[PDB]
């Protein structure tokens, strides 16, 4: 038993490792989207940079779980990071829809981890999730949903001018 | 009788209270428009912020009438603030058209109050309306009319790209 | 169903709308207190400004619930804002006692909403209430209780000098 | 006829001269109050300075009428400035009550002049009164009324401690 360990259930330790893998998986999926929008036959630079930043943020989420695991006296166990579901992402609308579903999948895993932490009476883990993870998900899900609404308004997928304008006006100029 | 009261007719005092209610009503209607444009399935952020600011300005108009009432020795009497006429506002064009009519309704009430103040020979109240209320209405009515003309030019309600562009270029970036 | 909606119960959505109305109601009651203390026959300016600020804070509480509703994919539904219980507020002690009870009524509604969020296993809503609402209530209830104790010490309601001194020394100079 | 004169009725010219005298009369009354509160057996320095400033403001009101008269092509005609109604002013409450009535007397004369200007269809004179005189009166009447309410709250005339505190906290520290 780690000398620091107190009120930290083995199930929660394991679930934190699984969550860590999912954060890394999400990072890798976003990195794939970045590379896609940087292709010369796609060429939406601000969209590409948006997904690059999304990828970097997921890696930070992963690293925070590693640090958490050690703070509680659990042990980080890594597994393969599975490649993303697609090799090409269609267009800005398809990619944003996939991002929305990814962020909701991550959110559900975090909510499930909160359920487990609650069941095991671990208020520190509950607070960690609430203070560091759950609001980030709600905020980003809202942001991405708002983007999707605007992409549809702009006539995606068919309206190329709409897609061009989204890249200029909706995402950060990079 | 209030010790400060001089040349302030009971009818004007009552009409000031009714005008106060109308300012609050207008504020609440604009707040509803703000919340509508902030919906994830509407997602026009600059338009939402435009209406939020419109709402804040109406509250300031209301507070100025409260202060006026007390300065003249009248007594503030509040009534319920009725909820807005609609729960959803359609799109930027429908909302702007409703805003135009709201500002004209407020303007007519102010003009009617000026008629009353004139009839009761209250030059202080006339000056207050002319110097603090009537030009604000003319200016904002012109601004909103100009917006409506541009929304029609941009192909509202059908042209989603037009609506997107209005939010980027016509209203303040927020 | 809103594309952003996840783990957000219809009951919680409805309760958030009811809470929004209560925040607006509280704002309006405080605005009435402001106008009362600004009367020439009351004339306690720092007390008036205290209640004006209380009113502005309640409006901010309301707006934060509107934003929350949309972030979760719920839909803002507004109802009439009922006028305050009184048209005149007696004196600083009576008004502060009414403020204490108002803040406790708001607190109870927030605690009830937390119970509901807990029952529906909504940790995001629980965190939102705990991080943005519940401590504000405890702090302001303590502040107002402290004021009431001092108003009683100063001989309210009978001691006019005491009431004058409270306005100079207890509330912020405005 | 003055070369500049246009739309300026002889009656208005005369009434402006009478108003000028009243402004000077008001100044002199306030100067008497200043000297009274500066007496060693009265010794309320901030109250004295309040009335000194009131006196200076009335002189500015008078000078503005002189300038106005000449701008319109009328001719300034001066009369004796009558001494104030009292040689001693009792206490802060009696003086403030006399100030309230003085400011209301001045206000009534200004309102009467506005009636005359209206009757003679002189919009420039109407605007001058509304923009330079009428709101000053409403504001100062409210200020003085508020003071009287506080003096009564403080137990004037009998409560010497109340009167002392008013001088320290209600009027500007000078
Ligand atoms: Cl261990
Ligand atoms: Cl343990
Ligand atoms: Cl334990
Ligand atoms: Cl265990
Ligand atoms: Cl594991
Ligand atoms: Cl596998
Ligand atoms: Cl693929
Ligand atoms: Cl997914
Ligand atoms: Cl968070
Ligand atoms: Cl967006
Ligand atoms: Cl641009
Ligand atoms: Cl956008
Ligand atoms: Cl009255
Ligand atoms: Cl009157
Ligand atoms: Cl009159
Ligand atoms: Cl009347
Ligand atoms: Cl009324
Ligand atoms: Cl009704
Ligand atoms: Cl509707
Ligand atoms: Cl209307
Ligand atoms: Cl104006
Ligand atoms: Cl425009
Ligand atoms: Cl425009
Ligand atoms: Cl929904
Ligand atoms: Cl849901
Ligand atoms: Cl869930
Ligand atoms: Cl539900
Ligand atoms: Cl509802
Ligand atoms: Cl009802
Ligand atoms: Cl009442
Ligand atoms: Cl209550
Ligand atoms: Cl809080
Ligand atoms: Cl206190
Ligand atoms: Cl003191
Ligand atoms: Cl002090
Ligand atoms: Cl205190
Ligand atoms: Cl002449
Ligand atoms: Cl002439
Ligand atoms: Cl003419
Ligand atoms: Cl003439
Ligand atoms: Cl003359
Ligand atoms: Cl004589
Ligand atoms: Cl005398
Ligand atoms: Cl007089
Ligand atoms: Cl003025
Ligand atoms: Cl005062
Ligand atoms: Cl005072
Ligand atoms: Mg060891
Ligand atoms: Mg284990
Ligand atoms: Mg970011
Ligand atoms: Mg993200
Ligand atoms: Mg993540
Ligand atoms: Mg494989
Ligand atoms: Mg908890
Ligand atoms: Mg937080
Ligand atoms: Mg964060
Ligand atoms: Mg946004
Ligand atoms: Mg009275
Ligand atoms: Mg009446
Ligand atoms: Mg504005
Ligand atoms: Mg407006
Ligand atoms: Mg208004
Ligand atoms: Mg109704
Ligand atoms: Mg004017
Ligand atoms: Mg103007
Ligand atoms: Mg203005
Ligand atoms: Mg313009
Ligand atoms: Mg949908
Ligand atoms: Mg429902
Ligand atoms: Mg505050
Ligand atoms: Mg409060
Ligand atoms: Mg509140
Ligand atoms: Mg009712
Ligand atoms: Mg906190
Ligand atoms: Mg706060
Ligand atoms: Mg304290
Ligand atoms: Mg000549
Ligand atoms: Mg003549
Ligand atoms: Mg002054
Ligand atoms: Mg004065
Ligand atoms: Mg004067
Ligand atoms: Mg004589
Ligand atoms: Mg003015
Ligand atoms: Mg002035
Ligand atoms: Mg004041």
From Swiss-Prot, chains A, B, C, D:
The keyword Transmembrane helix does not apply. InterPro entries: Ferritin (IPR001519), Ferritin-like (IPR012347), Ferritin-like_diiron (IPR009040), Ferritin-like_SF (IPR009078), Ferritin_CS (IPR014034), Ferritin_DPS_dom (IPR008331). Fe cation 2 binds at residues 58, 103, 137, 140. Fe cation 1 binds at residues 23, 58, 61. Keywords: Iron, Iron storage, Metal-binding, Oxidoreductase. GO terms for biological process: intracellular iron ion homeostasis; iron ion transport. GO terms for cellular component: cytoplasm. Its EC number is 1.16.3.1. CDD domains: Ferritin. Pfam families: Ferritin. One of its GO terms (molecular function) is ferroxidase activity. PROSITE patterns: FERRITIN_1, FERRITIN_2, FERRITIN_LIKE. Residues 6-155 form the Ferritin-like diiron domain. It comes from the Eukaryota. It catalyses: 4 Fe(2+) + O2 + 4 H(+) = 4 Fe(3+) + 2 H2O. Stores iron in a soluble, non-toxic, readily available form. Important for iron homeostasis. Has ferroxidase activity. Iron is taken up in the ferrous form and deposited as ferric hydroxides after oxidation. Belongs to the ferritin family. There are three types of ferritin subunits in amphibia: L, M and H chains. M and H chains are fast mineralizing; the L chain is very slow mineralizing. Oligomer of 24 subunits. The functional molecule is roughly spherical and contains a central cavity into which the polymeric mineral iron core is deposited. This is Ferritin, middle subunit.
